[PDB]
Amino acid sequence: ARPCIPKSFGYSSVVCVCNATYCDSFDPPTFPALGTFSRYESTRSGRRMELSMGPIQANHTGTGLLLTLQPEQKFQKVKGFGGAMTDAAALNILALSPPAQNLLLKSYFSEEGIGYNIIRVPMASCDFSIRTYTYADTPDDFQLHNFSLPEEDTKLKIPLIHRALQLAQRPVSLLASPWTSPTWLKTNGAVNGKGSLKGQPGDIYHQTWARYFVKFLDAYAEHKLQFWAVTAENEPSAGLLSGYPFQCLGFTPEHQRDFIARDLGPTLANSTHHNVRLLMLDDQRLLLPHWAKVVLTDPEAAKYVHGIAVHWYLDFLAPAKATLGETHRLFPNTMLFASEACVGSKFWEQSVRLGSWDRGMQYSHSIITNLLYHVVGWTDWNLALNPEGGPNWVRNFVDSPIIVDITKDTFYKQPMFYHLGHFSKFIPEGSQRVGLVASQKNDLDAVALMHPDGSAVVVVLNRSSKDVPLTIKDPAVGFLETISPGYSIHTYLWRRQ
Ligand SMILES: *[C@@H]1O[C@H](CO)[C@@H](O[C@@H]2O[C@H](CO)[C@@H](O[C@@H]3O[C@H](CO[C@H]4O[C@H](CO)[C@@H](O)[C@H](O)[C@@H]4O)[C@@H](O)[C@H](O)[C@@H]3O)[C@H](O)[C@H]2NC(C)=O)[C@H](O)[C@H]1NC(C)=O
Ligand SMILES: *[C@@H]1O[C@H](CO)[C@@H](O)[C@H](O)[C@H]1NC(C)=O
Ligand SMILES: *[C@H]1[C@H]([NH3+])[C@H](CO)[C@@H](O)[C@H](O)[C@H]1O
Ligand code: NA
Numbered sequence: 001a002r003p004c005i006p007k008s009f010g011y012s013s014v015v016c017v018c019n020a021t022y023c024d025s026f027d028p029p030t031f032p033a034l035g036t037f038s039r040y041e042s043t044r045s046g047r048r049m050e051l052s053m054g055p056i057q058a059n060h061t062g063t064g065l066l067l068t069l070q071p072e073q074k075f076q077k078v079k080g081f082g083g084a085m086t087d088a089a090a091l092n093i094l095a096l097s098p099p100a101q102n103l104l105l106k107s108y109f110s111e112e113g114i115g116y117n118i119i120r121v122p123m124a125s126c127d128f129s130i131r132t133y134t135y136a137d138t139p140d141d142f143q144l145h146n147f148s149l150p151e152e153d154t155k156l157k158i159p160l161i162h163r164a165l166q167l168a169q170r171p172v173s174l175l176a177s178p179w180t181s182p183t184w185l186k187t188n189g190a191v192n193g194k195g196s197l198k199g200q201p202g203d204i205y206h207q208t209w210a211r212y213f214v215k216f217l218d219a220y221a222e223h224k225l226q227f228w229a230v231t232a233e234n235e236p237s238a239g240l241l242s243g244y245p246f247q248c249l250g251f252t253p254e255h256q257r258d259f260i261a262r263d264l265g266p267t268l269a270n271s272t273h274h275n276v277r278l279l280m281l282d283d284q285r286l287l288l289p290h291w292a293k294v295v296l297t298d299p300e301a302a303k304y305v306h307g308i309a310v311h312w313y314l315d316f317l318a319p320a321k322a323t324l325g326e327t328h329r330l331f332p333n334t335m336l337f338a339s340e341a342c343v344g345s346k347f348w349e350q351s352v353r354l355g356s357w358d359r360g361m362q363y364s365h366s367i368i369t370n371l372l373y374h375v376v377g378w379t380d381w382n383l384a385l386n387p388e389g390g391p392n393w394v395r396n397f398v399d400s401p402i403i404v405d406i407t408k409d410t411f412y413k414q415p416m417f418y419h420l421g422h423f424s425k426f427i428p429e430g431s432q433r434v435g436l437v438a439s440q441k442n443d444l445d446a447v448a449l450m451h452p453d454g455s456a457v458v459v460v461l462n463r464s465s466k467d468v469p470l471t472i473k474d475p476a477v478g479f480l481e482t483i484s485p486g487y488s489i490h491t492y493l494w495r496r497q
Helices: 087-095 098-109 150-165 204-221 236-240 253-269 290-296 321-330 357-372 413-422
Strands: 015-018 036-043 051-053 066-077 080-084 118-124 175-180 229-231 277-284 307-311 335-340 375-382 400-404 410-413 432-438 444-450 456-462 468-474 480-485 488-494
Touching: 015 098, 015 335, 015 375, 015 456, 036 229, 051 175, 051 480, 066 375, 066 456, 080 413, 087 098, 087 150, 087 400, 098 400, 118 150, 118 204, 118 432, 118 468, 150 204, 175 204, 204 253, 236 277, 236 307, 253 290, 277 290, 277 335, 290 321, 307 468, 321 335, 321 357, 335 357, 357 413, 357 444, 357 456, 357 488, 413 488, 456 468
Parallel strands: 066 468, 080 118, 080 375, 118 175, 175 229, 229 277, 277 307, 307 335, 335 375
Antiparallel strands: 015 410, 036 051, 036 488, 066 432, 400 410, 432 444, 444 456, 456 488, 468 480
């Protein structure tokens, strides 16, 4: 293993500095012996997923905080964790020297790094692009004879996705989402602004747009890439808004319902891509449960919908119980999945705050809350950005867990990288959330899961300044005596047999 090289930029914590010859990494992962636990600790004071071990003891006395594992009490199974391969992320990554590129990709995708198993792939251009394009810009090509992948896919995204899959030990799931259709399919004839597909579901415009998904998956399959899932549209609500500044395509929930039922569902179902999952919504969770009721109460739409994708941007309006909780109660067999998050998109937020602990805590707080309300996965936005938070053709700059400094052939791993890795690295696909009961009221955020192999994982986040001693009881194994430092995040792992 190789430790964090810390650097301060005057914010609350440090970044870890990597370059062509050096990056912080782990040793090969294992469980310690039965009766021992592993702790990984990150702190605002500068610890970065530091590994320690302790004994699991037969007995416990005290009136301190006890968190009792409920291994019998089972909730959702995890799909996974990852980020987005936008044009901006791909340009930032490929601007590094080849050896620095490989250290960045290992940081995300390998067991020497944090074990990402999800990549979100935009279907052509979005705001995190430098060129505005679709795959079918030749007008009135309803046949899609002129559908093609440009160099943004064939030279940048696709080769990087192959290199990520080559570095991974866990199967990586690709997720595709479109921002805009070709402008000749749209009411407003522009990639942006208020506008929907022309006509109505079941017509030539909607059939063409559904066939465009199949053409996309056909083109990526020619490059030996297969998708786990697509979303029905990135942020369909955005295309309902006057002047929306970048690539969008407006659907009401009724329009999405009818488009899925008539066009996208049947077109995917009758293609070689029939196993590819379809996720609906791909938008702010305040739209639940209303969007889920509109789409999923129509059985002809419901039969094609695997899952509901959510974005975090208005989570402050949208209590998890009233949205995620209510949606799970009404549609328990339709998985909830978090498909886009980043800090820096509010007009008052600075784009990039190198070393921000607050932004790290925003990530881990969101992931825990999502996991506590049945969500099966969590997906970052841009995998890498430049120090301005770009490039972005409408200057909608944001933050990213990795910031590339091409003049120094350097990249910085921010607190958000480690906060996400406290989950991604230690919660493999198939992990099942289990109960975790507190003996008393407390300021911690915590979640417990069981690996498919039966081992235990617990993540504890302390967003307070105060150290909290605590005990974790696993009824079948014993007690972990520990302490959650102020402004810390821990992951605990142990064999149960
Ligand atoms: C890529 O990043 C690498 C990590 O920063 C760069 O390597 C570093 O280069 C600097 C400047 O030559 C070295 O700094 C000197 O450090 C020694 C202390 O050395 C040792 O102790 C440190 C821990 O404090 C440990 O990390 C090392 O392994 C050594 O045992 C001081 O005495 C000097 O005054 C001066 O500060 C770093 O030691 C060196 N680190 C490593 C791990 O090699 C590398 O140059 C960068 N590459 C490019 C192409 O830019
Ligand atoms: C579109 O595809 C057709 C059929 O292969 C081709 O002959 C035509 O020139 C293409 N059009 C453009 C404008 O690229
Ligand atoms: C999600 C989100 N609004 C971010 C940041 O604003 C944007 O860059 C993506 O296009 C969007 O889908
Ligand atoms: Na901003």
